Design a protein around this ligand. Structure first.
Ligand SMILES: Nc1nc(=O)c2c([nH]1)NCC(CNc1ccc(C(=O)N[C@@H](CCC(=O)O)C(=O)O)cc1)=N2
Ligand SMILES: Nc1nc(=O)c2c([nH]1)NCC(CNc1ccc(C(=O)N[C@@H](CCC(=O)O)C(=O)O)cc1)=N2
Ligand SMILES: Cc1cn([C@H]2C[C@H](O)[C@@H](COP(=O)(O)O)O2)c(=O)[nH]c1=O
Ligand SMILES: Cc1cn([C@H]2C[C@H](O)[C@@H](COP(=O)(O)O)O2)c(=O)[nH]c1=O
Lengths: 264, 264
């Protein structure tokens, strides 16, 4: 996509070589924002083939409040394998904070049900937020939340969402993260009877890993194709009842996939 | 400042009329980002006089972990009066989350000391974050955290910081919020022996209140003056030992102040 290839080029032209946690090394910039009008098409990268199966099942797993990778394995999705322990656990990452944030006094808060109630009863609220950055449980998480905090906004009957992503692997992570949150906005808009507005992505440390440079130059030579259209075939009873089969991505015709190593 | 007056104009040209919590009504946009290179000057608005006394003491109060307004009153700062209860309490807002985030198992986490330790021992970390959005205590807070989440970044010996502000009163709140966080970056950089880099401000619902329109048009006719220079006269033993007298803002010569009503 235009916005995405502009960011890849910006990291190549402006990024600082930086060491990182994995020992791979990165070219890095800090602070970037891009906006996707979801009315223009579903923002799935076309200059390389993205594995939709992994994107959709990872979002359905988050909405279940699940942090064990068994569900992903049942559905042949292996993207979280390298961080899980012997029992397949990841600790209280995304799904657990979204669905069951533990309070100091022992209660659990379901942020997704809270957001539904706010969108249905107080759409003008400036407080419609979900946060996975639970400071008191960071030490139990396999990987600290990268897409950490997001906010919904309603104006003129359209639902928008902004994500703050503290750390962004531009070649591998970001195509998945954009499609995942664009999908959640479509689901939320359908459940609340709203039209989809904008998805606003904001990044903190936005980086290309040093061993993704050949793949980056290859993808940068490709022309973006027309964005596909997302079709949700059914309106489930709730946001927690969607099924993989309910989604149709129409007209997706990408350039070939480009493999790249994951930095662990 | 150039960036600030460009945002005011953008809200006037592109904002949607929106109802809000206070009943005042706003012109609102969602998702904006601006960057201030702190090497260019201290980003204190010059097209209206800002009350530095309130800005500096509010930051020192946050760093103490204090949420009762008595300290502010001792220093003749009245900006939080309308939200405090009979005992002057605001509930577990900013200072308390920054200095003593309560964990599910009863521990308290001092995020500021954690950040100091990360900047001193692992400056390349992509996880150097402070969050005031504590989901399990939102219901005890007088006002939900508006400047909610921020991240530090170190590259080429320079310290940068990005703030996610979920809700932004452009005329009253934002001049104070920009100066406050720019001041914290200078303090952190001095304590860690770094140069100051960029302050990146990212907003969610960014708005002008309907009864600030005359004040906005007046300020938009003024030309920005040169930015002042911040001088910290002393290096305290720690980030918690700064005093009001340690700060000097040199060459601040603003246009006259513009009064405007606060929406409660
Ligand atoms: N270094 C790093 N970058 C990541 O983006 C990342 C990470 N670490 N930690 C875990 C994680 C979880 N999400 C993801 C997303 C995509 C792939 C991935 O390897 N995608 C490949 C193959 C997809 C497949 O399994 O079919 C791709 O080519 O997109 C891995 C993990 N993301
Ligand atoms: N509607 C709203 N907007 C705010 O920016 C705001 C709020 N509510 N809730 C509390 C709060 C706390 N921060 C602030 C910042 C500035 C002023 C204020 O009134 N500033 C005036 C006078 C400063 C003074 O007391 O000397 C100004 O003209 O800047 C109030 C509260 N900020
Ligand atoms: C989980 C996840 C990680 N990442 C990234 C960002 C970093 O490259 C790495 C996480 O490492 P970090 O915790 O040191 O920042 O994986 C994404 O880009 N998207 C994701 O969804
Ligand atoms: C505390 C604080 C509030 N605000 C704002 C944003 C909103 O106008 C209002 C808070 O209301 P809200 O919680 O309904 O968003 O005050 C700032 O802009 N800066 C601040 O530091």
């Amino acid at each position: 996509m235009k916005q995405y290839l502009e960011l890849m080029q910006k990291v190549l032209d402006e990024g600082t070589q930086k060491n990182d946690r994995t020992g791979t090394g990165t070219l890095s910039i800090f602070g970037h924002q891009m906006r996707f009008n979801l009315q223009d098409g579903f923002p799935l990268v076309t200059t390389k083939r993205c594995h939709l199966r992994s994107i959709i099942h990872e979002l359905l797993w988050f909405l279940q409040g699940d942090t064990n990778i068994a569900y992903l394995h049942e559905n042949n999705v292996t993207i979280w394998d390298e961080w899980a322990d012997e029992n397949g656990d990841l600790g209280p990452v995304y799904g657990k904070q979204w669905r069951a944030w533990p309070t100091p006094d022992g209660r659990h808060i379901d942020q997704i049900t809270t957001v539904l109630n706010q969108l249905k009863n107080d759409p003008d609220s400036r407080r419609i937020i979900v946060s996975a950055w639970n400071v008191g449980e960071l030490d139990k998480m396999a990987l600290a939340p990268s897409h950490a905090f997001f906010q919904f906004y309603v104006a003129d009957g359209k639902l928008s969402c902004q994500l703050y992503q503290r750390s962004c692997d531009v070649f591998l992570g970001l195509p998945f993260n954009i499609a995942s949150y664009a999908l959640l906005v479509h689901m939320m808009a359908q459940q609340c009877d709203l039209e989809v507005g904008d998805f606003v992505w904001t990044g903190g440390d936005t980086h290309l890993y040093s061993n993704h440079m050949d793949q980056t130059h290859l993808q940068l030579s490709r022309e973006p194709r027309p964005l596909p259209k997302l079709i949700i075939k059914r309106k489930p009873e709730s946001i927690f009842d969607y099924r993989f089969e309910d989604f149709e991505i129409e007209g997706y015709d990408p350039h070939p996939g480009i493999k790249a190593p994951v930095a662990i």
